[PDB]
Amino acid sequence: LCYHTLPHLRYPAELPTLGFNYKDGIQPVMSPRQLELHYSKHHSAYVDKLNTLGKGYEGKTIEEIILATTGINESKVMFNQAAQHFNHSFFWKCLSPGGKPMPKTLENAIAKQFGSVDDFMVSFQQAGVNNFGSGWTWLCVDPQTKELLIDSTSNAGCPLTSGLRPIFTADVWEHAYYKDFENRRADYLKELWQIVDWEFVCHMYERATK
Amino acid sequence: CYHTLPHLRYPAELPTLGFNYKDGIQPVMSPRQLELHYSKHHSAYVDKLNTLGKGYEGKTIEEIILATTGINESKVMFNQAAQHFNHSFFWKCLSPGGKPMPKTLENAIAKQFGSVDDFMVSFQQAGVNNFGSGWTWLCVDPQTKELLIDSTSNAGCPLTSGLRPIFTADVWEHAYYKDFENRRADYLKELWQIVDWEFVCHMYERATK
Ligand SMILES: [Fe+2]
Ligand SMILES: [Fe+2]
């Protein structure tokens, strides 16, 4: 009985149903093959591995597994699969072919924190570029202060392990962009905005700041 | 102290490859895979390190790595120097068509691991299981003269724990994604075919002296 970022995301794990047709990629940014690799190979493997480890978590959220395994050395393998499952699921919810325009509520909140949407985007791209190795770049709500914050994590790291509430993420594991952008992570992050589902981000913002 | 690459020095320079960098590393790495890895990834580490290393002129890259390891203020330089060393060492480990394993190294591997095939499977598994970006290494422990498989994350480098590498496989996704996409396991299985075991054996002989 507490807030979850994705309360519908539960164990036994399942690859999530995408808001759109997989075979089309996520135009204009991600090709069909880039999405197929990422979703049908990478994400699918985390779902499959997690299902060999999570006995006892039936009916519970994936976030509950993350929170029960975080910082525990003997549980690193399960933590990594559960967090990656959650991280990818959340990522797909953040995206849509051609994007969705940012509602006024969200625009105001982003400008109130960062000065403008443009200044937030510049800062967000920079944090993603600078995230050494594999990981994720996040926009989160701090529920105590109501601040919006950019946070980067390494590998399977997830800001909800520190009590932050994600509202947007960009995967910056090299596999997220290597098929279409090769080494060009900066270009990937700049182009990614064209496919962000800002309606989902705004929905997350409203519930996270309540 | 012992250096793995005593000729790899600052100011940093992309190393000359023992082969033509436009022809890839057949039969495993395509020309474009090698061009990206060397001319983009490795090249950016070199360039960035050269913005940071003033004062280290004439020193080994490994001395920079030792001077910056575990120091929070120097994380960025550590990452560049370590990655420059790791990639330069990787390229020496590889050759088109490979080079056959000399008996001395064959015997040492089989003594440590049970057999060469046992070593290879164990090494492949460690690379597959190295979560995220990193490197999987065959090293000599100079305190025992034993061989061991060691995995590192990100720019992590065995020398910071007093180990002497003799072989490494890059398992950053960029090392294999062009030719193998998500198939890291296949990459590691196929990588044996371009391994320069003459260099690996030279390193073994040197590390255990
Ligand atoms: Fe991913
Ligand atoms: Fe690399």
Expressed in angstroms and rounded, the spacing between residue B14 Cα and the centre of ligand 1 is: 30
Residue A38 among known ligand-binding residues? yes
Name the residue among B36, B134, B155 with its Cβ closest to that of A183: B36
Name the residue among B36, B132, B155 with its Cβ closest to that of A134: B132
Cα B7 to Cα B60: distance, rounded to the nearest angstrom: 7
CB contact at 8 A, A42 and A15? no
Cα B56 to Cα B53: distance, rounded to the nearest angstrom: 6
CB contact at 8 A, A191 and A29? yes
- A135-141, strands of its sheet edge to edge: A148-154, A135-141, A165-171
Chain B residue numbers with beta carbons less than 8 Å from the beta carbon of A154 are 132, 154
Question: What distance in Å separates residue B183's CA from the closest CA in chain A?
Answer: 9
Resolution in A: 1.9
A80–B40 C-beta distance less than 8 A: no
- B164-170, strands of its sheet edge to edge: B146-153, B134-141, B164-170
CB contact at 8 A, B199 and B165? no
The answer to whether A173 contacts chain B (CB < 8 Å) is yes
Cα B18 to Cα B150: distance, rounded to the nearest angstrom: 26
CB contact at 8 A, B150 and B141? no
B79–A132 C-beta distance less than 8 A: yes
CA dihedral B200, B151, A129, B175 (to 10 degrees): 40
Residue whose token pair is 């440590």: B112
Chain A residue numbers with beta carbons less than 8 Å from the beta carbon of B83 are none
Contacts 24+ apart (CB under 8 A), B62-66: B62/B3, B62/B4, B62/B5, B62/B8, B62/B159, B64/B10, B65/B157, B65/B159, B65/B160, B66/B159, B66/B160
CB contact at 8 A, A100 and A119? no
Strand B164-170 and strand A148-154: the pairing is: unpaired
Cα A122 to Cα A119: distance, rounded to the nearest angstrom: 5
- Solving technique: X-ray
Cα B187 to Cα B174: distance, rounded to the nearest angstrom: 12
| Tokens read off for A17 | 């149903």
Which ligand approaches the C-alpha of residue A136 most closely? 1
Alpha-carbon separation of residue B25 from A89, B17, B188 (angstroms)? 37, 11, 14
Question: Of B155, B131, B145, B180, nearest to A83 (Cα)?
Answer: B131
Phi, psi of B98 (to 5 degrees): 65, -175
For an interface test with B, the pick among A134, A136, A171, A179 (most B C-beta atoms closer than 10 Å) comes out as A134
Q: How many CA atoms are closer than 13 Å to the CA of A188, on its beta-carbon side?
A: 23
Looking at chain B, how many residues does it have? 209
